[PDB]
Amino acid sequence: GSMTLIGVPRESAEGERRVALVPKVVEKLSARGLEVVVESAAGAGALFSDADYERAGATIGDPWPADVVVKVNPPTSDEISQLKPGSVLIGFLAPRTQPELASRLRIADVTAFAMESIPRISRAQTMDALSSQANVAGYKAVLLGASLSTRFVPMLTTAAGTVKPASALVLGVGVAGLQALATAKRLGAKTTGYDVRPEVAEQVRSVGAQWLDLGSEAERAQQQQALEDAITKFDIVITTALVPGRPAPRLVTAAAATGMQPGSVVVDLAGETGGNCELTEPGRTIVHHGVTITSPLNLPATMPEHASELYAKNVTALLDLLLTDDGVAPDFTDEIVAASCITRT
């Protein structure tokens, strides 16, 4: 590993607090003989110091000309300009929403792997960055809902009075939605999950939530109306549904939100692509007819040490495929390597 240098930059995006490698993971790479260069204050968002990285065997310095640069968010034009020809870049590279990025990296002679493009196969389970970040997001979505609510989540019997538990509904039960159900349940909520994919029922039940069953043309309208009616009954509604490269599916109409009791909260995780809720204002928290509608845009950044640690393990699992005793040598017959590389033509 001594001839291979891995570079970790500070994330430049507004509000970002994650860093692509954390000191514990850097320590493992150093122990294997790889050289790691970490940009000064790269870990500052996650409350790490430069000394933490140096203790893990890194040097503090310019990360951009490394043989392999590992980062979180897509690189800016100015960042790409600093990559050296023949290098590898690993990170979220927005293959759907930033298609020019692939072109730019190819022109720069950088071989680049998009973490979003890691295929959903058994061998890649440890490399699934979309899932690790979504786990953090689902957990923090519940904390945000509970923090904005005007009411307790758990049932409590106090000397002053008794209160019923909150009912929480999660719409879209992928990784974030499942973690939201689990976290809401921990906190004492009565929980219900809904997803257009029927096979998700088992997962919803496995975390102790009720599976919402609604009951083609005039039937589809009865269904939409049944979903709208169901939403009005909940104190906390968390929406998570995405379509890669497309607007977020509309799941919470204006009427549904308006029909919720005062002090209820809708936590819409889909704000970057338009929101699942018609009344969502991306990146803001607003009140509509006494109902709080909030649209966090980067929940992983709000819990940045564990978001970064999990992400770092995802990135290093992929990197381990790319490394041989000879240094950096991606095997393009490996499905994971071929599927995630955005620069190969």
Known binding-site residues for Ca(2+) equal: 3, 57, 67, 320, 323
Distance CA 279, CA 265 (A): 12
Of the ranges 80-88, 137-145, 190-198, 243-251, which one interacts with its own copies (CB under 8 A)? 137-145
Decide if residue 309 touches its own copies (CB under 8 A). yes
Q: Which residue has tokens 């989540």? A: 153
Query: Taking the complex as a whole, how short is the minimal distance between the CB of residue 23 and its own copies, in angstroms?
Result: 10
Rg (CA), the chain: 22
Q: Identify which of residues 3 and 243 has a Cβ nearer to Ca ion in the complex.
A: 3
Distance CA 56, CA 24 (A): 7
Task: Judge contact between 151 and 167, C-beta under 8 A.
Answer: no
Decide if residue 125 touches its own copies (CB under 8 A). yes
Helix (H, G, I), strand (E, B) or coil at 191: strand
- Taking CB under 8 A as the criterion, the residue among 77, 147, 333, 345 binding its own copies is 147
Binding residues for its own copies, rule CB under 8 A, total 49
Nearest CA-CA partner of 93 in 290, 342, 287: 342
Decide if residue 1 touches its own copies (CB under 8 A). no
Show Cβ contacts of residue 179 under 8 Å, excluding neighbours closer than 6 positions.
Answer: 134, 135, 137, 138, 139
Distance CA 241, CA 82 (A): 36
Residue 31 binds which of Ca ion, its own copies, Na ion, none (CB < 5-8 A, kind-dependent): none
Decide if residue 340 touches its own copies (CB under 8 A). no
Query: Taking the complex as a whole, how short is the minimal distance between the CB of residue 43 and its own copies, in angstroms?
Result: 9
Helix (H, G, I), strand (E, B) or coil at 122: helix
What kind and span of H or E run contains 87?
Answer: none
249-268 positions binding its own copies, by CB under 8 A: 262-263
Task: Judge contact between 20 and 71, C-beta under 8 A.
Answer: yes
32-71 positions binding Ca ion, by CB under 5 A: 35, 57
- Taking CB under 8 A as the criterion, the residue among 140, 171, 181, 240 binding its own copies is 140
Contacting residues toward its own copies, per CB under 8 A: 46-49, 52, 125-126, 128-129, 131-132, 135-136, 139-140, 143-144, 146-147, 149-152, 154, 156, 158-161, 163, 183, 186-188, 262-263, 287, 290, 292, 302-306, 309-311, 313-314
